[PDB]
Amino acid sequence: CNGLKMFLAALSLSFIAKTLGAIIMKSSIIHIERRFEISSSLVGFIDGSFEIGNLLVIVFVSYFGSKLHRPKLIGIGCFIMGIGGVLTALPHFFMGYYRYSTLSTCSYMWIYVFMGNMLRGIGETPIVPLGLSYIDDFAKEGHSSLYLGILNAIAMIGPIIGFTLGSLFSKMYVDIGYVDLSTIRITPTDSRWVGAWWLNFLVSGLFSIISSIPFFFLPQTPNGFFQSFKSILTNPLYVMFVLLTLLQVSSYIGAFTYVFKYVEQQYGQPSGVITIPIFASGMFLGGYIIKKFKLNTVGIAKFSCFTAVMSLSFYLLYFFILCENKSVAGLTMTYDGNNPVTSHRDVPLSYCNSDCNCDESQWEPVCGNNGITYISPCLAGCKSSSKKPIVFYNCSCLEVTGLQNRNYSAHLGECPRDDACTRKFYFFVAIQVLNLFFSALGGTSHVMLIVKIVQPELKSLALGFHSMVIRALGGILAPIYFGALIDTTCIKWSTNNCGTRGSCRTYNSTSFSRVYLGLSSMLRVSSLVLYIILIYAMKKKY
């Protein structure tokens, strides 16, 4: 080690700490929501507190931190992350004991957590611009993309530790170390269970303090705001690349948020041993292509454009592997088994289920032996049911030509589709593995191009403003508009106990497939068009 490799070790440890902090935030939210007895809007305000605290100070710390001692401010920010991690687990330590206490036949402690999220927002401020500028200003020429691939590979260790510690600490009770465990009457499958959410934030806070330790032992060298912000914003290639990476990252975010719901509606499977080493090998392979081939600035830009072309070339093959529409009574066709419907809004009742006085808004999916799913066992005509095996006898809403055996023997749940589109589901997950591998080969080039576009005195400000646009308009508003364009195609709306915004149970699978592939595909096509404009104007400039 020549000292600078110690900075890469400390930056790898800080990336492990920030990835761990994000997985611990996204993992233990239901224990906080059940423990503090707060509503959905309040716990969403807790969850958005981190984005508020990061987005408020990211541009000012990324501007003012580059002139100062950079790894000292990274250590100060990681210590602030550790203080927030201790402060998030701190409401467990002084509120006392936690207290918790269908046949279908025809209270103000959360502000602590809020402040901890704000502190953790400051804890994710100084790491990503400043030290990456410290990679580009002090490593040798061509070595920096290899270091970016190395730290993006080592930052995947953090979600693995986050999943393992989240599942292990959600296994036991919240009050372990204080009560006798034989007195607990509830299970982890019970609705009143609260896992040990504080152990997650305690390991996150102490690991952030140990990651804040070795930054203070590194040397500074191994051997106005408005005018500078105007000089960044009036650069046309930079703002074109920021709008480009905003469209591409927004396509990625709106893709992978709803892949498992697309699996549940289209291919019928409920919701990564191999996936995370594939992504880590993709990032390290892309860093090795940029390092080994001695690519210049427009070469890195054409390499990112070629990975975008390759990823979109397999992304457009999702349209040809669609399975059929599911057969549901009362949503896509009538209850009697004969006639389709024009629309799913306020369907008429049939003669078989007219005597059945159950709730039409109640959702409990069953299917018969004909392969047609029914939305409730009351509207399936089933009058008697058995128990660990599932059987609904004497169902009267399945009309055939006098078959005696085709009136009963129905189980619960969505029974799966034919075997023709299970192989198409395997094709979908194989092409998704290929698309995520080519997105990983895209990878470090988005970070690597920014420090070569802008001036060498303003690399950290450019990285901070790019982090503002990517984390702000991609991380927040893009799940909102993909959620709007996905939930506009619901077919069975759930009547919630409180009010509106209930999660719809099933979808119109071809229409939801069309809108979910279409918005992401048009966003990626417009992003690729902005790559072609960027290559043409960037070769014109160079």
């Binding site: 920030k18 995947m156 979600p159 990625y252 996936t275």
Partner: peptide, 11 residues
């Protein structure tokens, strides 16, 4: 990685 969000700053 998995997931949701992105970045790619994570996973």
């Amino acid at each position: 990685x998995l997931l949701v969000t992105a970045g790619l700053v994570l996973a």
